[PDB]
Design a protein around this ligand. Structure first.
Ligand SMILES: CCCCCCCCCCCCCC(=O)O
Ligand SMILES: CCCCCCCCCCCCCC(=O)O
Lengths: 158, 158
């Protein structure tokens, strides 16, 4: 693996609801560079299932347009780690959250990697961004993006 | 203006020679996002003139290819500030350099802005990157990119 920061005592039910992708970082530039880059995904809502799986609603630019997407992250034996199914095993880790303001996560498959700082409101949270940059110093990131409140209220952060 | 960090006692003649754009940051995502983004420029060599102007040799992706470019930054009454001529006055500021290892600069024209961390060798200089991130905390950056030694040895950081 690469990420080695997870949240202890995570209650997944408590991450339900509205989120904003305030910032994103990735191990490779091409993961985040254009609007249609593979990991350029904007989180809209987290919906944990009664069984403790996590449905994710996001927006993604595909074929010159901002498309909705609904994804399932299946629980593992580790509360802070989930699995999306693909041609390749892709792992979601929750690094840190306070439920009410911010949540940091990374997704990972040379191993590749993207992380975001999620926030509850269309506001620049300097404190959440601090924690995001601290978490990222452990990691081989090569691109970082952040969004302003105006963009945060547009579909696909236009 | 926006940038408010310049190097005191700058000797421009001493920045002559080979440089590598190790990292870049900008105030707007669209300034750096694709390979043909307007401020995605890779520095190759600095050539200060006897009169104290600064010629810059760089590479830039334009029309699906990595083109060379030669640019003149004309001196001002301030040693650490130079001017490129365009439809709009565009200002180059030297923030910090030690001549032998690293140099930080910003270019600026809502005012927009891009900065790079230049290094003498195709090596990841953690120390130069520290200084770059410190300088950038004063600034409204929204995209940051960094390159690995393999890319640093390819034209247009391929
Ligand atoms: C607890 C935070 C969980 C957020 C997880 C976001 C995972 C989305 C990854 C989807 C990858 C790109 C989308 C796709 O093309 O399928
Ligand atoms: C002392 C460091 C000076 C480095 C200055 C680099 C200035 C290059 C800016 C050129 C902007 C894009 C190129 C172009 O399209 O003309």
């Amino acid at each position: 693996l690469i990420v080695t920061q997870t949240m202890k005592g995570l209650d997944i039910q408590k991450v339900a609801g509205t989120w904003y992708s305030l910032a994103m970082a990735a191990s490779d530039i091409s993961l985040l560079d254009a609007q249609s880059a593979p990991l350029r995904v904007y989180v809209e809502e987290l919906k944990p299932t009664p069984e403790g799986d996590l449905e994710i609603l996001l927006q993604k630019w595909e074929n010159g347009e901002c498309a909705q997407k609904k994804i399932i992250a299946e629980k593992t034996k580790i509360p802070a780690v989930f699995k999306i199914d693909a041609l390749n095993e892709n792992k979601v880790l929750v690094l840190d959250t306070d439920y009410k303001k911010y949540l940091l996560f990374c997704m990972e498959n040379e191993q590749s990697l993207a992380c975001q700082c999620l926030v509850r409101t269309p506001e620049v949270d300097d404190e959440a961004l601090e924690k995001f940059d601290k978490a990222l110093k452990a990691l081989p990131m090569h691109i970082r993006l952040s969004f302003n409140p105006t963009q945060l209220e547009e579909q696909c952060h236009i």
